[PDB]
Amino acid sequence: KKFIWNSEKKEFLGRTGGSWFKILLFYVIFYGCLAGIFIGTIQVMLLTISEFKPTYQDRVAPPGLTQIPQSQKTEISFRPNDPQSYESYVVSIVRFLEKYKDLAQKDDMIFEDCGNVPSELKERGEYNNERGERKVCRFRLEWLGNCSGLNDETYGYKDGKPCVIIKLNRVLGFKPKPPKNESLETYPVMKYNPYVLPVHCTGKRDEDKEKVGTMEYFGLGGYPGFPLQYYPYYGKLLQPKYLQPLMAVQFTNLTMDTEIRIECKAYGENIGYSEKDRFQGRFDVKIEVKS
Amino acid sequence: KERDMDELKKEVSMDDHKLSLDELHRKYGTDLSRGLTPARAAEILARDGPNALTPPPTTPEWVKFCRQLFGGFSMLLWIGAILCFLAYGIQAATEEEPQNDNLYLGVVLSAVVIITGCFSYYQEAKSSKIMESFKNMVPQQALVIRNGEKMSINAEEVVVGDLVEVKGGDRIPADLRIISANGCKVDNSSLTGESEPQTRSPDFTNENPLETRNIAFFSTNCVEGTARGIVVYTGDRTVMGRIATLASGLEGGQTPIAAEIEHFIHIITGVAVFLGVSFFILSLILEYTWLEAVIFLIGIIVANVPEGLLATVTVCLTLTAKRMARKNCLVKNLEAVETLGSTSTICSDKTGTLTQNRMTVAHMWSDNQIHEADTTENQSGVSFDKTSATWLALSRIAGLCNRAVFQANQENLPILKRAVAGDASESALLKCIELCCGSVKEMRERYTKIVEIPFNSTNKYQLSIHKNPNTAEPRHLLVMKGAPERILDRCSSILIHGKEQPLDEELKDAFQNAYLELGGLGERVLGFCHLFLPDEQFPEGFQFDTDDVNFPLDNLCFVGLISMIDPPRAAVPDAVGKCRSAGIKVIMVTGDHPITAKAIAKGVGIISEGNETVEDIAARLNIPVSQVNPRDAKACVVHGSDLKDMTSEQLDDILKYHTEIVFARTSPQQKLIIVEGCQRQGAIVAVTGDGVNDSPASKKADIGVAMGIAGSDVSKQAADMILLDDNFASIVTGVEEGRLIFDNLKKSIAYTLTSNIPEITPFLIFIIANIPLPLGTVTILCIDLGTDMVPAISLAYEQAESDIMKRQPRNPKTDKLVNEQLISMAYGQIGMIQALGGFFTYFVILAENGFLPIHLLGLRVNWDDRWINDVEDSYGQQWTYEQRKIVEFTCHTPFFVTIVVVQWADLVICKTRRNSVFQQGMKNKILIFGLFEETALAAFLSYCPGMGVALRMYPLKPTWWFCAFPYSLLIFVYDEVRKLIIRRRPGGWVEKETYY
Amino acid sequence: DPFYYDYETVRNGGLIFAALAFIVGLIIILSK
Numbered sequence A: 001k002k003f004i005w006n007s008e009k010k011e012f013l014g015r016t017g018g019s020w021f022k023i024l025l026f027y028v029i030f031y032g033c034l035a036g037i038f039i040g041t042i043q044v045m046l047l048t049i050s051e052f053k054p055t056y057q058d059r060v061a062p063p064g065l066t067q068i069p070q071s072q073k074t075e076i077s078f079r080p081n082d083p084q085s086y087e088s089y090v091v092s093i094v095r096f097l098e099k100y101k102d103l104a105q106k107d108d109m110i111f112e113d114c115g116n117v118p119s120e121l122k123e124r125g126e127y128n129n130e131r132g133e134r135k136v137c138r139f140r141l142e143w144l145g146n147c148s149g150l151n152d153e154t155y156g157y158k159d160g161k162p163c164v165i166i167k168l169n170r171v172l173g174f175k176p177k178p179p180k181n182e183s184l185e186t187y188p189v190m191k192y193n194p195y196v197l198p199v200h201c202t203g204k205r206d207e208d209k210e211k212v213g214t215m216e217y218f219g220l221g222g223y224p225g226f227p228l229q230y231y232p233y234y235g236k237l238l239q240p241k242y243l244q245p246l247m248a249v250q251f252t253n254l255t256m257d258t259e260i261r262i263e264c265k266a267y268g269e270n271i272g273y274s275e276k277d278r279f280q281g282r283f284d285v286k287i288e289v290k291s
Numbered sequence B: 001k002e003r004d005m006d007e008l009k010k011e012v013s014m015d016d017h018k019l020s021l022d023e024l025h026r027k028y029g030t031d032l033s034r035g036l037t038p039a040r041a042a043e044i045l046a047r048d049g050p051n052a053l054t055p056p057p058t059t060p061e062w063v064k065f066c067r068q069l070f071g072g073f074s075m076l077l078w079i080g081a082i083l084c085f086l087a088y089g090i091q092a093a094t095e096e097e098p099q100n101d102n103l104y105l106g107v108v109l110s111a112v113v114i115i116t117g118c119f120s121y122y123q124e125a126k127s128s129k130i131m132e133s134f135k136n137m138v139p140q141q142a143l144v145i146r147n148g149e150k151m152s153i154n155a156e157e158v159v160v161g162d163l164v165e166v167k168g169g170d171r172i173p174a175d176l177r178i179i180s181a182n183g184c185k186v187d188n189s190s191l192t193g194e195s196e197p198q199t200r201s202p203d204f205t206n207e208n209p210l211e212t213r214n215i216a217f218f219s220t221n222c223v224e225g226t227a228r229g230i231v232v233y234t235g236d237r238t239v240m241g242r243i244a245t246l247a248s249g250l251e252g253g254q255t256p257i258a259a260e261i262e263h264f265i266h267i268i269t270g271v272a273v274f275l276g277v278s279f280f281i282l283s284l285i286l287e288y289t290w291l292e293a294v295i296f297l298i299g300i301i302v303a304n305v306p307e308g309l310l311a312t313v314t315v316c317l318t319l320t321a322k323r324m325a326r327k328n329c330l331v332k333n334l335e336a337v338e339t340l341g342s343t344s345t346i347c348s349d350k351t352g353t354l355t356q357n358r359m360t361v362a363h364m365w366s367d368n369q370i371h372e373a374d375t376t377e378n379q380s381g382v383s384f385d386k387t388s389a390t391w392l393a394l395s396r397i398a399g400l401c402n403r404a405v406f407q408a409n410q411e412n413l414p415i416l417k418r419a420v421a422g423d424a425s426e427s428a429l430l431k432c433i434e435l436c437c438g439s440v441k442e443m444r445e446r447y448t449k450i451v452e453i454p455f456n457s458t459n460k461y462q463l464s465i466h467k468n469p470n471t472a473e474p475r476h477l478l479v480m481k482g483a484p485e486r487i488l489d490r491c492s493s494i495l496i497h498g499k500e501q502p503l504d505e506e507l508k509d510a511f512q513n514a515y516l517e518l519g520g521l522g523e524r525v526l527g528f529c530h531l532f533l534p535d536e537q538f539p540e541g542f543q544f545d546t547d548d549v550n551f552p553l554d555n556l557c558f559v560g561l562i563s564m565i566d567p568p569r570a571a572v573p574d575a576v577g578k579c580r581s582a583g584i585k586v587i588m589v590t591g592d593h594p595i596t597a598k599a600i601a602k603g604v605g606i607i608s609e610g611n612e613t614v615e616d617i618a619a620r621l622n623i624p625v626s627q628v629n630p631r632d633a634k635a636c637v638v639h640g641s642d643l644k645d646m647t648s649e650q651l652d653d654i655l656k657y658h659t660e661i662v663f664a665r666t667s668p669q670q671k672l673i674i675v676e677g678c679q680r681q682g683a684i685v686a687v688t689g690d691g692v693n694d695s696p697a698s699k700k701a702d703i704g705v706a707m708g709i710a711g712s713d714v715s716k717q718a719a720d721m722i723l724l725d726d727n728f729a730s731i732v733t734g735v736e737e738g739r740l741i742f743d744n745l746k747k748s749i750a751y752t753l754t755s756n757i758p759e760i761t762p763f764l765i766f767i768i769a770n771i772p773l774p775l776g777t778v779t780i781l782c783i784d785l786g787t788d789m790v791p792a793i794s795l796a797y798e799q800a801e802s803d804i805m806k807r808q809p810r811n812p813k814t815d816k817l818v819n820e821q822l823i824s825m826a827y828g829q830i831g832m833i834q835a836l837g838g839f840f841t842y843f844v845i846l847a848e849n850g851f852l853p854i855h856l857l858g859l860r861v862n863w864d865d866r867w868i869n870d871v872e873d874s875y876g877q878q879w880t881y882e883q884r885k886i887v888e889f890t891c892h893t894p895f896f897v898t899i900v901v902v903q904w905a906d907l908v909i910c911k912t913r914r915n916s917v918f919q920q921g922m923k924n925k926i927l928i929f930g931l932f933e934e935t936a937l938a939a940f941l942s943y944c945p946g947m948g949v950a951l952r953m954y955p956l957k958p959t960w961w962f963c964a965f966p967y968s969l970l971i972f973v974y975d976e977v978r979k980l981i982i983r984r985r986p987g988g989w990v991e992k993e994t995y996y
Numbered sequence C: 001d002p003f004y005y006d007y008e009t010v011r012n013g014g015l016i017f018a019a020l021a022f023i024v025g026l027i028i029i030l031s032k
């Protein structure tokens, strides 16, 4: 009963040739109309959104806190001697900072020299297209001392006492608000509380906090945070080649051959946290410089 | 070697009955008037086993429970669950932080099969739980003569070769060889099917042990008189014993509904493996390795298996089975409820099934006029004219001169169903006078009987003289009854409206053609007469001692004849008409005499009025039967005497060219062969019987239909459906509900098969376009095992779109449950719109949150990564892992809601296969609740506090509930115009390709 | 701020709808 393939009375795979053509033609027209309908409705959907602002922005309420060495498990395990052991790290750091070189930020028509001191926020009008392409404040690698250097094509970084810079999640129209001068026990920090978003790193328990001896922060003018003069963001369409602020963190006194956990928590009123997302506001890392 | 054992039972039985009295006693070593010594009796008792059929093969409850966990459909969910743990075995060992979705899925599939097994098992076991409440097996002791003395012992304590005596009313224990009888009439109804009480005489008569009268049979009752017999067969070796053992040892077959289940899976997996394999090849062509491609093969195939369809189908069958139980039409099998709808040939039994198996007064003769009496079991028919002197005289002759009365407890029972002691003929006469002529109690004691003359072995006449208490005439009233040929000789006067007339041939020949009318109708005719004795020649003190001529045998006044026969049940003829209207070929199968079988078939509808048999054509032309052409006779009678010498091909030819067939005098084994012959035609056969001869026919039949009270216990257990009310119209109700649930199952199947496309397409393009997951697993379970449960079940409550009792029976090889038309609509068109609607809501949510639909291409590579917490969207924003994963899960929840939205219209369109929604109408209240529950439950699964915590289903922004609205409306429009064109164009395009 | 969504109000309305539509469905199958 399963050899209905053909017969002398015309059937193929179950039906005739004229029937195969009728069915195939119908399905082509039907699915063609279905495709045209889905495309027309998806076009109306595209017409319900603008080019300068996402309609819903509540799912990114607390900005994240990422790092340069996008590790497979947020762990930094390498050998202070073997250059190939830490190649995966340095490669990502150089590729990340490749857009921050002095040669990359050379056009004066799209770049604006903000300043050597963190200042107040810079609002470039509204988010519409009435104004031209907004300017992006420059951020030279020199601001991150001891984690930038004037190295060649390969940024000879720190083998012993590594460097891990932190970055605030770029959010459109987001205005960072640092904590009030009434700081609720925020771990020794500079008095530049009004024009910089503070970020403080620490261990995770009584063990990690003891293994991590000394940490040195680097930023704009020497402040451990992000300057307010670089916010808010006006989208990729209006601000292409935008350079968000960076802040490096170096762990000088580490206990070699020991995996220790570090939590870099960014503080502020407009900075939320989440017990489910260990990256919202805070940031974790597992460093282990095994010799 | 049990094959040979079954072949020795399908053979017709043999005996050693035809032997001299001395030969039988020597072969058995038994005294004829004394039996045997009790020690000899106990010696055989502990030799071959007590006289009782071996209990049925007990069926332990764990066996049938594990039975419900297997089958054909549940087997598909089992291999699917195994593939889930197999896929999980490959996934766990190979990837990091594996997800608990596949393991969650494997255990859920296992739970689905288990719960379905428990629910279906509870229903099948409930049918048996009420069936065990019908075993009212009352122990019946037998009267055996041993050591020259009479003794009453249990039937099991009876052995072979000993004298056994039976009284009128006693049930024959084992098979006896009558040695001395005295007016003994036995009831061979429950065994061979002989309706009228067949008498038993010690003299050997026919070569067939069934027709001969020197044999008493197992499970047969002695109607009247007494008789003696030597036990020949005992226990299971008995006649009905070998029949019962044969029924238990016969195959049950494959139900038509189960065959549709098998053909259903043949396509479900055919496309599942086609999609899985073709996509497995595609995935390896792209970039996915063998490790991941194997999981893709399993995921695509496993998703294409409707998990919730097993439970919905089981409940869908259970609902119709519930209605069967409401009308006292129980089904021992949960799926046997469908078999009636697929039936195209019903093999019915005459005695007990079609007929009431009880002698009843059929017609009366008065004033040269036939008067039909009411013969309905419930007494709801036409009443004759009961206001004439001819009627009062005839009624008095019957009510008075008749050896029949009621019993003790027979006081509250109805006039017909109550018990009467005596001859079956005398019992019928009593039930008719007690119903149409007041009461026979006072009507009998009124005319005081002086001297009676019972029936005689020759010239069978029964007369008696009574006193006349009328306040006008003191003359004695003599009454007599007998065969018309035995009373015409003893009559000279004729009664008409009150006055007498001579035996003029102008009315006497008119009496002969009427006698030939009732006789030709297959009934038993009797003649009643009376006469006024001259009190001047026989004073009030003269005692008419029964010796010499005290009553004038001749010169009597004849009033009229009274015929009688077992009538068909009340709703039997109408039901036969409904089945033939439905296209079901009705075939009478019985062991009764052909003279009555042909007449009963004429009266129920198996034989149409006007059609002639092969014999009828010859008699109409006064020519031999061998000359007529059998093609000229649409109907034909088949005797068991000729069926024995037949081949399979000959029986096929009888069924092919004869539309109305009646099998008479067919042995129980021949009943089995007849059913096997109808099955060779490939048509679905249903057997409706009651006696033990119907056990081998009902068991092998696709569905056995037995009588709840008037049916023997053996054929009642071998059947698949029982009629506790014995209303044969339940067969018509069964065929109606069978075709009804079949088409409703098609609708429910297409509904669950439609949701499959939007359930798998997200995961398909997830592999192709490399976009984030459009729909999650847990969200799919909320559809197949949550919301859609109510619409699928509510689709069973759908009524008929047109008259189902007007269409012809479905061809098994043609009208399949699931064909390429249903799939062309569910998987091809309707489900396709549901899939695209889901993708619409998918792109809508992502684009409104900053992920343009064009930007989502190739994003799953970094999207599914857990540590890349800065993935650039379309506006330049950076999304963390949970920030974007929350969006993905809150994109699965509205996708699930999108499914419910398109399922609104999908439910309304699947509700009607051909009629418009305006024609059929939204009167299905369960379906209305199906929409309300499905919708409200869907909103609960998204807005309850903690859904995004347990089921990872986050709340929806209110604008998503309308992203899928036009898709449902479009589905409704396209399917509505489709069925509209099916209405105006019943030709081919919209009917052969889309209609299913 | 445009980065705050009133999820509690929308969620509240969703459950009230799930209550009304369900109890009304119950009234539907109870034609009395």
Ligand SMILES: *[C@@H]1O[C@H](CO)[C@@H](O[C@@H]2O[C@H](CO)[C@@H](O)[C@H](O)[C@H]2NC(C)=O)[C@H](O)[C@H]1NC(C)=O
Pocket: A145, A146, A216
């Ligand atoms: C950056 O690294 C240089 C080393 O190349 C550090 O310079 C040393 O600073 C200490 C004081 O902390 C002096 O005692 C040493 O003599 C310096 N050595 C050299 C070679 O210059 C410098 O301190 C580091 N900068 C920061 C901010 O930590």
Ligand SMILES: *[C@@H]1O[C@H](CO)[C@@H](O[C@@H]2O[C@H](CO)[C@@H](O)[C@H](O)[C@H]2NC(C)=O)[C@H](O)[C@H]1NC(C)=O
Pocket: A213, A214, A253
């Ligand atoms: C850097 O860390 C080292 C420990 O690795 C500190 O030196 C140790 O001090 C303890 C006493 O508290 C001694 O028992 C150890 O022998 C010391 N080890 C070494 C290698 O010197 C050191 O004080 C830390 N320095 C700074 C600037 O934090």
Ligand SMILES: CC(C)CCC[C@@H](C)[C@H]1CC[C@H]2[C@@H]3CC=C4C[C@@H](O)CC[C@]4(C)[C@H]3CC[C@]12C
Pocket: A023, A024, A027, B764, B768, B820, B823, B824, B828
């Ligand atoms: C991931 C993408 C590329 C897969 C595309 C699959 C499309 C082209 C397939 C999926 C289901 C298919 C249909 C399945 C059902 C029918 C009816 C049958 O009697 C003839 C084939 C026909 C008419 C098919 C046409 C092609 C079809 C629509």
Ligand SMILES: CC(C)CCC[C@@H](C)[C@H]1CC[C@H]2[C@@H]3CC=C4C[C@@H](O)CC[C@]4(C)[C@H]3CC[C@]12C
Pocket: B918, B973
């Ligand atoms: C592009 C689409 C939306 C337009 C299609 C037109 C639809 C919506 C119109 C066209 C014909 C209309 C139907 C005409 C006939 C009937 C039967 C009548 O007893 C009630 C109204 C009813 C049920 C109408 C309902 C609305 C209807 C189906």
Ligand SMILES: CC(C)CCC[C@@H](C)[C@H]1CC[C@H]2[C@@H]3CC=C4C[C@@H](O)CC[C@]4(C)[C@H]3CC[C@]12C
Pocket: B935, B939, B958, B959, B961, B962, C009, C010, C011, C012, C013, C014, C017
């Ligand atoms: C086709 C028609 C007749 C079906 C009628 C049901 C429609 C109108 C109902 C079914 C589900 C409903 C939604 C259920 C849930 C929500 C969330 C709530 O916080 C606001 C209302 C909102 C957004 C409802 C809008 C109206 C809605 C889409």
Ligand SMILES: C[C@]12CC/C(=N\OCCN)C[C@@H]1C(=O)C[C@@H]1[C@@H]2CC[C@]2(C)C(=O)CC[C@@H]12
Pocket: B091, B095, B096, B097, B098, B099, B101, B102, B105, B299, B300, B302, B303, B763, B776, B777, B780
């Ligand atoms: C289980 C899964 C594949 C494995 C998986 N994650 O595998 C990566 C482990 N590191 C989760 C996927 C889902 O949740 C969705 C699953 C999919 C297999 C196929 C499934 C089960 C379907 O037909 C519908 C849901 C689909």
Ligand SMILES: *[C@@H]1O[C@H](CO)[C@@H](O)[C@H](O)[C@H]1NC(C)=O
Pocket: A181, A191, A193, A194
């Ligand atoms: C915060 O308070 C300190 C003294 O407690 C003061 O020196 C500093 O200027 C204050 N900063 C602001 C922004 O008020």
Ligand SMILES: [Mg+2]
Pocket: B303, B305, B306, B307, B308, B755, B756, B759, B784
């Ligand atoms: Mg499904």
Ligand SMILES: [Mg+2]
Pocket: B189, B190, B193, B349, B350, B351, B352, B353, B689, B690, B691
């Ligand atoms: Mg019977």
Ligand code: NA
Pocket: B251, B252, B253, B698, B699, B700, B701, B702, B703, B704, B718, B719, B720
């Ligand atoms: Na059966």
